[PDB]
Design an enzyme around this catalytic site. Structure first.
Site, PDB file in Angstrom:
ATOM      1  CG  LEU A   1      -3.531  -9.364   7.531  1.00  0.00           C
ATOM      2  CD1 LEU A   1      -2.786  -8.358   8.395  1.00  0.00           C
ATOM      3  CD2 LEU A   1      -5.009  -9.037   7.454  1.00  0.00           C
TER       4      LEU A   1
ATOM      5  N   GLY B   1       2.995 -14.436  -0.168  1.00  0.00           N
ATOM      6  CA  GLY B   1       4.005 -14.230  -1.190  1.00  0.00           C
ATOM      7  C   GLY B   1       5.280 -14.977  -0.857  1.00  0.00           C
ATOM      8  CB  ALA B   2       8.680 -14.670  -2.324  1.00  0.00           C
TER       9      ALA B   2
ATOM     10  N   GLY C   1       6.540 -15.297   2.617  1.00  0.00           N
ATOM     11  CA  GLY C   1       5.813 -16.215   3.464  1.00  0.00           C
ATOM     12  C   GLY C   1       4.351 -15.838   3.539  1.00  0.00           C
TER      13      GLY C   1
ATOM     14  CE  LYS D   1       8.365 -11.788   6.682  1.00  0.00           C
ATOM     15  NZ  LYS D   1       9.415 -10.739   6.597  1.00  0.00           N
TER      16      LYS D   1
ATOM     17  CG  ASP E   1      13.118  -1.050   0.459  1.00  0.00           C
ATOM     18  OD1 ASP E   1      12.870  -0.435  -0.602  1.00  0.00           O
ATOM     19  OD2 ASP E   1      12.646  -2.180   0.729  1.00  0.00           O
TER      20      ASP E   1
ATOM     21  NE  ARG F   1       8.678  -1.001  -2.390  1.00  0.00           N
ATOM     22  CZ  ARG F   1       9.342  -0.153  -3.165  1.00  0.00           C
ATOM     23  NH1 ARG F   1       8.711   0.726  -3.926  1.00  0.00           N
ATOM     24  NH2 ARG F   1      10.672  -0.184  -3.174  1.00  0.00           N
ATOM     25  CG  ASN F   2       8.928  -0.411   2.031  1.00  0.00           C
ATOM     26  OD1 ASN F   2       8.153  -1.311   1.709  1.00  0.00           O
ATOM     27  ND2 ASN F   2      10.159  -0.318   1.546  1.00  0.00           N
TER      28      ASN F   2
ATOM     29  CG  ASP G   1       8.813  -3.662   4.278  1.00  0.00           C
ATOM     30  OD1 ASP G   1       8.383  -4.440   5.154  1.00  0.00           O
ATOM     31  OD2 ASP G   1       8.365  -3.648   3.114  1.00  0.00           O
TER      32      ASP G   1
HETATM   33  C1  R25 Z   1      -5.994  -4.885   8.816  1.00  0.00           C
HETATM   34  O1  R25 Z   1      -4.665  -5.135   8.744  1.00  0.00           O
HETATM   35  C2  R25 Z   1      -4.115  -5.032   7.475  1.00  0.00           C
HETATM   36  C3  R25 Z   1      -4.896  -5.264   6.320  1.00  0.00           C
HETATM   37  C4  R25 Z   1      -4.296  -5.160   5.050  1.00  0.00           C
HETATM   38  N1  R25 Z   1      -5.126  -5.401   3.804  1.00  0.00           N
HETATM   39  C5  R25 Z   1      -4.728  -6.653   2.980  1.00  0.00           C
HETATM   40  C6  R25 Z   1      -5.633  -6.907   1.745  1.00  0.00           C
HETATM   41  C7  R25 Z   1      -7.053  -6.783   2.022  1.00  0.00           C
HETATM   42  N2  R25 Z   1      -7.419  -7.883   2.922  1.00  0.00           N
HETATM   43  C8  R25 Z   1      -7.455  -5.517   2.687  1.00  0.00           C
HETATM   44  C9  R25 Z   1      -6.649  -5.196   3.963  1.00  0.00           C
HETATM   45  C10 R25 Z   1      -2.924  -4.833   4.906  1.00  0.00           C
HETATM   46  C11 R25 Z   1      -2.144  -4.607   6.055  1.00  0.00           C
HETATM   47  C12 R25 Z   1      -2.729  -4.712   7.339  1.00  0.00           C
HETATM   48  N3  R25 Z   1      -1.950  -4.475   8.579  1.00  0.00           N
HETATM   49  C13 R25 Z   1      -0.530  -4.858   8.743  1.00  0.00           C
HETATM   50  N4  R25 Z   1       0.016  -4.690   9.947  1.00  0.00           N
HETATM   51  C14 R25 Z   1       1.223  -4.995  10.165  1.00  0.00           C
HETATM   52  C15 R25 Z   1       1.983  -5.518   9.099  1.00  0.00           C
HETATM   53  C16 R25 Z   1       3.525  -5.934   9.366  1.00  0.00           C
HETATM   54  O2  R25 Z   1       4.281  -5.182  10.027  1.00  0.00           O
HETATM   55  O3  R25 Z   1       3.944  -7.154   8.858  1.00  0.00           O
HETATM   56  C17 R25 Z   1       5.056  -7.792   9.530  1.00  0.00           C
HETATM   57  C18 R25 Z   1       4.462  -8.888  10.438  1.00  0.00           C
HETATM   58  C19 R25 Z   1       5.924  -8.366   8.437  1.00  0.00           C
HETATM   59  C20 R25 Z   1       1.386  -5.687   7.849  1.00  0.00           C
HETATM   60  C21 R25 Z   1       2.123  -6.254   6.597  1.00  0.00           C
HETATM   61  C22 R25 Z   1       3.543  -6.101   6.239  1.00  0.00           C
HETATM   62  N5  R25 Z   1       3.757  -6.736   5.072  1.00  0.00           N
HETATM   63  C23 R25 Z   1       5.062  -6.821   4.389  1.00  0.00           C
HETATM   64  C24 R25 Z   1       2.524  -7.308   4.595  1.00  0.00           C
HETATM   65  C25 R25 Z   1       2.222  -8.061   3.425  1.00  0.00           C
HETATM   66  C26 R25 Z   1       0.958  -8.491   3.208  1.00  0.00           C
HETATM   67  C27 R25 Z   1      -0.086  -8.185   4.165  1.00  0.00           C
HETATM   68  C28 R25 Z   1       0.215  -7.446   5.310  1.00  0.00           C
HETATM   69  C29 R25 Z   1       1.497  -7.009   5.535  1.00  0.00           C
HETATM   70  N6  R25 Z   1       0.158  -5.352   7.726  1.00  0.00           N
END
Ligand code: R25
Length: 305
Positions: A24, A27-28, A30, A51, A143, A147-148, A161
């Protein structure tokens, strides 16, 4: 008053019982995967986001990520993100509920064309509900930003976050941070100058977060250096009124930006005032033309014993 014991449970999962499927984001921090978790001998499939830290040999990171797991393990609320467990492999990795629609900031940017006034108001309510729960848990997010906020469905959002969150100690009212990297455009003035963070600091950030939604993902103080941000607030300036906000909505986020934190609103109050506006959304926002998967179980139905 005093502090009660925190009997939250932390579950340790095995690497074998969950499978990463796709990436998904990277970055830094991980790498974050989309995957399925299958608790052994429970006949359920739980869609998860996994993650893992980028480098195994990073001692500060492991101490800081376990701090996030500690915070998230202690919160249980429909509008705060759900931790499912952690895995203690060579690279430690924690497992969270999958939010299929990504962050709310990216969502309003990708769907600026057709987002109704009722969605925007309901989101304001749900975020206020999450933040009021954290205040009841004596937890300071530090925070809060668009975005969060993750999106489960378009009608259900959640706060996440907690890498900067701190649990306000017993008989303590402020945090008094020692220092570190921070997001300046979302911070109260008292936090900027004096590194003091309170529940009323987060209310300030709440006001900016609402402003991001009303502007459909615009950047606050765009073009202005963060260095000059402090002098701007001291001279009494704030963020301008979004073109779709009636005076009633803008008045509330302005109260969130008063320098005396004690006179700013409280999340319990913000719930009521946005709940009242959600009854008739078009009176308060004027938007042009707004009118095998057999055994899968969402994490919100997989409760822990
Ligand atoms: C379907 O699902 C997702 C898809 C995306 N698009 C990414 C870019 C394109 N393909 C289109 C789709 C984004 C998010 C999700 N769903 C999701 N669910 C839970 C989390 C979460 O709690 O993360 C924990 C384990 C740290 C996250 C998430 C949180 N952070 C900081 C991220 C950084 C980068 C990517 C995802 C995340 N994202």
């Amino acid at each position: 008053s005093g502090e009660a014991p925190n009997q939250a449970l932390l579950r340790i999962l095995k690497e074998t019982e969950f499978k990463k499927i796709k990436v998904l984001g990277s970055g830094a921090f991980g790498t974050v995967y989309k995957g399925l978790w299958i608790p052994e001998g429970e006949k359920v499939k739980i869609p998860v986001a996994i993650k893992e830290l980028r480098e195994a040999t990073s001692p500060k990171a492991n101490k800081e990520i376990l701090d996030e797991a500690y915070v998230m393990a202690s919160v249980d609320n429909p509008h705060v993100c759900r931790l499912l467990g952690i895995c203690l492999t060579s690279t430690v990795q924690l497992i969270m509920q999958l939010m299929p629609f990504g962050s709310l900031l990216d969502y309003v940017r990708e769907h600026k064309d057709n987002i109704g006034s009722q969605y925007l108001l309901n989101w304001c309510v749900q975020i206020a509900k999450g933040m009021n729960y954290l205040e009841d848990r004596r937890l300071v997010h530090r925070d809060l930003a668009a975005r969060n906020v993750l999106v489960k469905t378009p009608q259900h959002v959640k706060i996440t976050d907690f890498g900067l969150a701190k649990l306000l100690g017993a008989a303590a009212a402020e945090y008094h941070a020692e220092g570190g990297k921070v997001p300046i455009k979302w911070m109260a003035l008292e936090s900027i100058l004096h590194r003091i963070y309170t529940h009323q600091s987060d209310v300030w950030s709440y006001g900016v977060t609402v402003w991001e939604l009303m502007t459909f993902g615009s950047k606050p103080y765009d073009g202005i250096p963060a260095s000059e941000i402090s002098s701007i607030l001291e001279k009494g300036e704030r963020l301008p009124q979004p073109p779709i906000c009636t005076i009633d909505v803008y008045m509330i986020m302005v109260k969130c930006w008063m320098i005396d934190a004690d006179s700013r609103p409280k999340f319990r109050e913000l719930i009521i005032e946005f709940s009242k506006m959600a009854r008739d959304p078009q009176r308060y926002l004027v938007i042009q033309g707004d009118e095998d998967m057999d055994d899968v179980v969402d994490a919100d139905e997989y409760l822990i014993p």
